[PDB]
Every structure is written in C-alpha cells, then in structure tokens.
Amino acid sequence: ASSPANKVYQDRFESMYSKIKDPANGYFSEQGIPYHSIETLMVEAPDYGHVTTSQAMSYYMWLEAMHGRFSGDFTGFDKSWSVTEQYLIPTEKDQPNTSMSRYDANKPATYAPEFQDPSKYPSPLDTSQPVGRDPINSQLTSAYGTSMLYGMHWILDVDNWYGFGARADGTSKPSYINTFQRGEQESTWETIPQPCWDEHKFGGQYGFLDLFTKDTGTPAKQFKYTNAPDADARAVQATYWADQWAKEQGKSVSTSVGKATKMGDYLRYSFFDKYFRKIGQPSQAGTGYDAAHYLLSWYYAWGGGIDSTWSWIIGSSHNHFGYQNPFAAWVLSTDANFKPKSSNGASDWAKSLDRQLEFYQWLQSAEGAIAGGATNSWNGRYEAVPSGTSTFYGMGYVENPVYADPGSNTWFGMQVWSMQRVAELYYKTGDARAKKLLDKWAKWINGEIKFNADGTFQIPSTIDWEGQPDTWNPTQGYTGNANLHVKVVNYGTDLGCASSLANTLTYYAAKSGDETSRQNAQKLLDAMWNNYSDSKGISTVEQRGDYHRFLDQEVFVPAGWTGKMPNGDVIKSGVKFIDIRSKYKQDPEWQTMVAALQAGQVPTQRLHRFWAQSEFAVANGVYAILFPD
Numbered sequence: 001a002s003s004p005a006n007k008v009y010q011d012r013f014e015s016m017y018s019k020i021k022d023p024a025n026g027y028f029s030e031q032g033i034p035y036h037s038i039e040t041l042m043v044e045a046p047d048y049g050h051v052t053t054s055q056a057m058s059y060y061m062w063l064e065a066m067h068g069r070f071s072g073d074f075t076g077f078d079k080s081w082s083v084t085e086q087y088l089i090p091t092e093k094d095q096p097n098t099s100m101s102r103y104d105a106n107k108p109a110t111y112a113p114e115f116q117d118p119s120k121y122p123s124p125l126d127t128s129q130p131v132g133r134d135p136i137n138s139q140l141t142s143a144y145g146t147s148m149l150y151g152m153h154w155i156l157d158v159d160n161w162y163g164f165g166a167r168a169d170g171t172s173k174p175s176y177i178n179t180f181q182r183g184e185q186e187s188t189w190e191t192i193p194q195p196c197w198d199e200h201k202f203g204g205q206y207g208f209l210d211l212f213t214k215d216t217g218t219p220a221k222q223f224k225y226t227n228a229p230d231a232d233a234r235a236v237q238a239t240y241w242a243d244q245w246a247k248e249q250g251k252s253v254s255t256s257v258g259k260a261t262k263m264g265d266y267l268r269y270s271f272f273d274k275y276f277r278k279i280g281q282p283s284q285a286g287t288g289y290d291a292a293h294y295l296l297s298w299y300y301a302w303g304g305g306i307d308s309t310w311s312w313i314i315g316s317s318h319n320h321f322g323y324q325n326p327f328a329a330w331v332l333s334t335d336a337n338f339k340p341k342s343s344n345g346a347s348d349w350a351k352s353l354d355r356q357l358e359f360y361q362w363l364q365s366a367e368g369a370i371a372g373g374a375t376n377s378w379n380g381r382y383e384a385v386p387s388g389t390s391t392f393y394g395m396g397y398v399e400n401p402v403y404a405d406p407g408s409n410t411w412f413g414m415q416v417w418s419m420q421r422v423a424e425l426y427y428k429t430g431d432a433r434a435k436k437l438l439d440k441w442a443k444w445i446n447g448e449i450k451f452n453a454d455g456t457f458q459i460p461s462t463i464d465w466e467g468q469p470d471t472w473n474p475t476q477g478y479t480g481n482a483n484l485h486v487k488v489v490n491y492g493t494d495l496g497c498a499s500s501l502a503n504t505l506t507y508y509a510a511k512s513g514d515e516t517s518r519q520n521a522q523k524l525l526d527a528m529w530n531n532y533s534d535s536k537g538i539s540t541v542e543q544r545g546d547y548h549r550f551l552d553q554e555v556f557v558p559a560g561w562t563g564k565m566p567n568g569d570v571i572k573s574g575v576k577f578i579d580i581r582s583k584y585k586q587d588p589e590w591q592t593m594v595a596a597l598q599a600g601q602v603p604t605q606r607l608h609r610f611w612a613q614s615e616f617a618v619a620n621g622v623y624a625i626l627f628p629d
C-alpha cells in the first residue's frame with residue numbers, strides 16, 4: 001500500500017495532469033505524441049514548436065508514472081512507452097538490419113574533423129586516421145539477437161511540417177529529421193533541417209549529405225540517427241519510480257521495465273570516445289574499454305546504407321555535467337529488476353556511477369555551482385591540450401562543452417536538471433559523495449532565490465565563469481577549487497527551471513533535514529501555483545531576445561551548392577533563417593513578432609513548454625510524497 005501524501009500538493013499534481021492531458025489544450029498531436037510546446041513559433045533548441053524530442057517523451061513518462069502513484073492506474077505509463085517505441089526508436093524499416101548487421105566492430109566509423117565555424121563544412125572523411133575498436137557490440141547482438149540499436153532518436157517532425165515525410169515519401173507522419181551537423185558555432189538559427197532517411201529526393205543532387213560530410217566518391221543514399229543521452233537516462237529514472245510505486249500498490253509495469261533496461265544497455269554507447277580513441281591518449285586507437293570515459297557524453301549516433309549494406313556507430317568525446325544521471329546509473333548497476341541482459345551491462349554502469357560522481361566533484365566551483373565538463377578531443381580534432389589546462393583522467397577542461405552559441409553552461413537550467421538526479425541518489429542511498437556535493441550546491445542556490453513582496457520571484461537565469469578546476473587526482477579528491485568561480489549575470493522567472501529547482505531542494509531537504517531547502521522549495525511551488533496559473537497549466541510573459549535572428553541570421557551554404565526544401569524554398573548562398581522555412585510566415589504569431597522587431601522592441605511570448613509543465617506537475621507530486629504533513 002502506498003504511504004500517505006500531502007493532499008494539497010497531490011491535488012495540484014492532479015489538476016496539472018488534467019490540464020496537460022486535456023484534448024482542448026493541445027499539448028498532444030493526433031497520434032498521442034507530446035509537442036515541445038503548445039505554441040508553434042518556437043526556436044531555442046528545436047526550431048519549431050510542433051516537433052517532439054526524446055526529452056519531451058522522457059518527461060511524459062515521468063508524469064504518467066506519478067499519475068499512477070496517485071491514481072493506481074499505470075496504463076498511461078505503459079502507453080507512454082508504447083508511443084516511444086512506435087515513433088521515436090527507429091523500427092526495422094528505419095534502420096534495416098541488412099545494413100546494421102554489416103557493422104564492423106574493429107572499424108566502427110571513419111574519422112572526420114570537427115570545425116569551429118560552419119563555413120568550414122563539409123568535413124572531409126579520412127580513412128587513414130586511427131579509429132579504435134568497439135568492445136560492446138558483441139555483448140548487445142548476443143543478448144538481443146539483432147544489430148539494430150534500441151535508443152531514442154532525439155527529434156521528430158510530428159505533423160510533417162517540413163515535408164520530408166516517412167522514409168522519403170513526403171506525406172507520412174511523423175517524420176524523422178535532424179538539424180545540428182556543423183560544430184560548436186552552429187546555433188539552432190544556423191542549421192539546414194534534413195531528413196534522417198536520405199534517398200536524395202529532397203535538397204540537392206545528393207540530398208543534404210554533401211553539405212556536412214565530404215567523401216572521396218559519390219554520396220550514397222543512407223540513414224542516420226542521433227541519441228540525446230540525458231533523455232534515455234531520464235527514461236530509466238522515471239521507469240524505476242513507476243516500478244516502485246506500482247509494486248507498492250500490487251500493480252505491475254513489467255513490460256515497460258524490460259524496455260527501459262534494454263534502453264540503458266544500449267545507452268552505454270555514450271560512454272565511448274567519438275572514434276574510440278584512448279581516453280587521455282587521444283592520438284592512439286583504443287583496444288576496447290580503454291576508449292570509455294564512463295560518462296554520459298553529448299550523444300551516440302549510428303547510420304548505414306539504404307541502397308547498399310554497411311553501417312557505422314560513434315560515441316562522443318565531449319562531456320557536459322548537465323547530462324549526467326548517477327541515479328539511473330545506480331538503478332542499472334544495483335537493482336536486480338533493472339539488470340541489463342548483456343554480459344557487462346550492470347558492471348559498466350557501476351563504473352559509470354563512480355566516474356560520474358568524481359566528475360561532478362572535480363567541477364564544483366568555489367561557490368558551489370557546477371562548471372562545464374571535459375573533452376577527449378581538443379577542438380574536435382584530437383589536438384594537443386594547451387599547457388596549463390587542467391584535466392580529468394587526461395581530458396581537458398572545457399567551460400562550455402560542445403556549443404559556444406550560446407555557451408552550453410551559461411544557462412542555469414543545467415544546474416537543476418543534473419543536481420536533481422544527485423538529490424534522488426542521496427535520498428535513496430544517503431551516499432556521502434552525493435551529500436558533500438549537495439550541501440555546498442544547495443547553500444549556494446538558497447542564497448540566490450529572491451521572493452518579492454507581490455508574490456513573484458526570481459532565480460539565476462544566465463551565468464558566467466572564471467578560472468578552471470584543479471587537475472583531478474582521485475586519491476586526493478576535491479581541493480575546493482579556489483580558482484573556479486561562477487557569476488550570476490542576470491535573474492529571471494523560468495518556470496521550468498524553478499520547478500526542477502523545487503524538486504532538487506525537496507529531495508535534499510527530506511534526507512538532510514535542511515529546513516531552508518524545504519521552505520524555499522514550498523515557497524517556489526506556492527508562488528507558481530498562486531501567481532502564474534492559467535487555463536493550460538502555468539506561464540509567464542518572457543522576452544525572446546534572439547528572435548531578431550529569424551530575419552537577420554545568414555545560413556551558410558557551400559559555394560555552388562543549390563537545392564530545395566520540400567515546400568520549394570530555395571537553399572543557396574545568401575539565405576536567411578526564414579528563407580528556408582517560409583511556412584513560418586503563416587504562423588498566427590508571425591505578424592505580432594515582426595511588428596515588434598520593426599518597432600525596435602524585443603518580442604515577448606507566453607509559452608507552454610511540455611517539459612516545463614510536466615516539471616511543475618512532478619515537483620508538486622514529489623513534495624506531496626516527501627512531506628505528507
């Protein structure tokens with residue numbers, strides 16, 4: 001039987017759940033897939049509001065798990081997994097096993113350098129550069145009996161807004177698409193959206209392939225997908241809770257547990273260097289696990305031929321603290337129900353749990369906030385790490401891992417998303433490493449929360465950094481990082497970030513007994529409910545400072561390359577963001593946005609992001625369960 005929950009906060013979870021599932025609100029598509037946001041004029045990570053992301057699906061899982069906890073009905077949780085497998089994990093028609101089974105574990109992929117400016121792409125493949133061997137493929141094919149990968153592709157054009165359709169048909173939905181392809185300086189405003197399944201039917205002569213990669217021969221028709229590791233790890237985390245809560249009620253979500261465990265098994269691909277180069281010795285091809293950094297890197301990607309049979313897989317050399325999930329790592333390495341079928345699954349996750357906690361500690365600034373991360377590939381070309389750069393297991397410290405436009409660790413959101421998982425681990429196990437990280441981090445953030453007399457509040461929005469952490473030495477541990485400092489540049493009222501912050505502080509307060517954390521958490525939840533509630537969940541008016549880029553951001557296109565988007569928009573040198581997405585001019589908010597830009601004002605919007613609304617719903621449920629009185 002489930003323990004008693006605080007009725008006030010449980011009612012708030014239930015109300016939010018109803019608003020989110022309400023057909024009249026429009027959070028979901030006709031096929032039952034959650035959109036990034038109700039509003040369509042939306043550019044920030046995805047570039048259209050009605051795409052879905054693996055991030056959104058993992059939050060949909062978390063929300064349903066919590067609903068099962070309070071309603072005793074888990075059919076909604078099972079459906080969230082059913083929709084995920086059907087639409088976001090490439091089926092056998094999407095990643096043909098005829099091509100995947102031709103994968104060579106001794107030569108996973110061909111090397112190509114990464115560049116610091118989009119104008120340097122396409123990147124040339126070089127078969128002469130070393131690539132290490134993949135030690136886990138044989139464990140996976142043996143356990144699952146297929147060469148296909150079981151992980152979520154990160155983004156999906158749900159209603160076929162771009163027009164690529166399914167597997168080049170131009171009319172089916174949903175449509176697997178990708179955007180980012182050209183390095184750290186390619187922001188969301190600088191991409192050329194392309195289909196994951198490229199048969200050369202759209203774009204240029206060879207589809208969109210030769211805009212990004214250059215091979216010696218003529219480009220082959222091919223498919224390719226990219227995982228967002230933090231999303232798949234959150235799927236495991238949510239499923240573990242669904243399992244606990246269901247068992248407390250004599251119910252079962254067994255089939256969903258099996259899918260989550262399999263997902264966590266394939267997620268181990270994010271533990272490896274991009275081209276399987278030895279960690280700390282980037283010039284050398286790895287011989288197996290010496291190429292594993294054991295952290296959740298920015299991605300793992302795979303692809304292969306459509307017209308011929310071949311395939312490749314790559315991990316990622318770049319690591320950000322914001323993606324780590326020590327809670328998911330503890331579940332997969334210690335809980336018997338979540339033990340992966342592969343021979344080394346549970347043990348690799350046990351190594352990752354230890355490595356991740358060391359990574360967070362190495363990165364903790366003098367004040368408490370967590371710094372960026374590290375990379376095993378300097379400048380994305382395995383260049384020499386400049387002297388004086390501190391390192392973690394041979395990997396050089398990077399202030400803003402992967403992206404510089406804008407910096408990936410300048411947004412406060414990463415702090416709460418990632419520390420929330422540490423709070424859960426601490427709550428369940430009382431781990432000393434987790435406690436040490438949280439005591440300092442929570443002291444830092446509790447001094448940055450500002451409540452106003454009118455009931456509104458502000459938390460850090462944009463942050464900046466100075467210095468670097470001291471080189472990590474595992475036998476000596478944290479030095480205090482006196483030379484690494486965080487600076488809060490400005491404050492804001494991001495409701496998704498505040499809900500995640502409330503969740504983190506609630507788990508931490510329930511275990512540590514810290515009253516300040518508990519009352520700050522409750523004041524954040526009350527403030528949001530009482531002053532930011534609306535008919536669709538919660539919202540506030542926010543400035544869209546980068547929206548001028550719709551009209552003025554030039555998109556790089558190689559000299560002489562011309563092609564067309566499915567709707568006829570011409571892709572060629574000179575185009576702006578809006579030129580290859582002309583359908584946006586039909587958006588209901590378009591004229592309003594443009595009128596503001598014309599008058600020299602910053603456009604504003606009232607947004608209902610799926611992840612933010614679910615975050616607030618879950619934050620209320622966590623509080624109802626941990627503080628029942």
Ligand SMILES: OC[C@H]1O[C@@H](O[C@H]2[C@H](O)[C@@H](O)[C@H](O[C@H]3[C@H](O)[C@@H](O)[C@H](O[C@H]4[C@H](O)[C@@H](O)[C@H](O[C@H]5[C@H](O)[C@@H](O)[C@H](O[C@H]6[C@H](O)[C@@H](O)[C@H](O)O[C@@H]6CO)O[C@@H]5CO)O[C@@H]4CO)O[C@@H]3CO)O[C@@H]2CO)[C@H](O)[C@@H](O)[C@@H]1O
Nearest residue numbers: 109110111112154180183213226227228298299301310312
């Ligand atoms: O000999 C057999 C046949 O070989 C063929 O040649 C093949 C060759 O074998 C193969 O190895 C080669 O593979 C390369 C691919 O062609 C190439 O496209 C691929 O590019 C990677 C790229 O290296 C990587 O940087 C890029 O990362 C992006 C990612 O795409 C994007 O989704 C991700 O987005 C994240 C967001 O940034 C984040 O905010 C959000 O939250 O999550 C998103 C998801 O993680 O961002 C990252 C980083 O910016 O991914 C692309 C893949 O899309 O690299 C391969 C390895 O080098 O292909 C060759 C040609 O196909 C011969 O052609 C044939 O004749 C022979 O028979």
Ligand SMILES: OC[C@H]1O[C@@H](O[C@H]2[C@H](O)[C@@H](O)[C@H](O[C@H]3[C@H](O)[C@@H](O)[C@H](O)O[C@@H]3CO)O[C@@H]2CO)[C@H](O)[C@@H](O)[C@@H]1O
Nearest residue numbers: 044045055411413461462492494496542543544545609
């Ligand atoms: O890529 C990380 C996640 O980003 C989420 O979007 C956030 C933007 O990255 C962030 O820039 C924005 O915050 C702005 C805010 O909109 C503006 O009013 C203020 O002046 O400046 C802030 C800082 O630039 O917030 C959004 C929403 O939290 C994506 O929603 C998410 O999918 C993605 O993982």
Ligand SMILES: [Ca+2]
Nearest residue numbers: 185186187405
């Ligand atoms: Ca740029």
